[PDB]
Structure formats: structure tokens, C-alpha cells
From Swiss-Prot:
Impact when changing F31A: Decreased binding to globulin
Name of the protein this chain belongs to: Albumin-1 chain b
Effect of V29A: Decreased binding to globulin
Disulfide bonds: C3-C20, C7-C22, C15-C32
Length: 37
């Protein structure tokens, strides 16, 4: 698994891959994802 699970802003990288992005939607949490590049 590359960029998945929960993502954090306080954290950086938010997941571990810069090509991936953190999607904070939970008013209290976000989630990591690794789209195709």
C-alpha cells in the first residue's frame, strides 16, 4: 500500500508519498490516497 488510510496535515508528508495527497474531509480526520501519475 502506498498512500492510503487516514491522512494528516499536522503530519508531513501526510502519508509518505509527495505524488499522493491527503484528503481531509472529516471535520476531524482526513484520508490518504495514491492516485495514478
Amino acid at each position: 500500500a502506498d498512500c492510503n488510510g487516514a491522512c494528516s496535515p499536522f503530519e508531513v508528508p501526510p502519508c509518505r508519498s509527495r505524488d499522493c495527497r491527503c484528503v481531509p474531509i472529516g471535520l476531524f480526520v482526513g484520508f490518504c490516497i495514491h492516485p495514478t501519475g
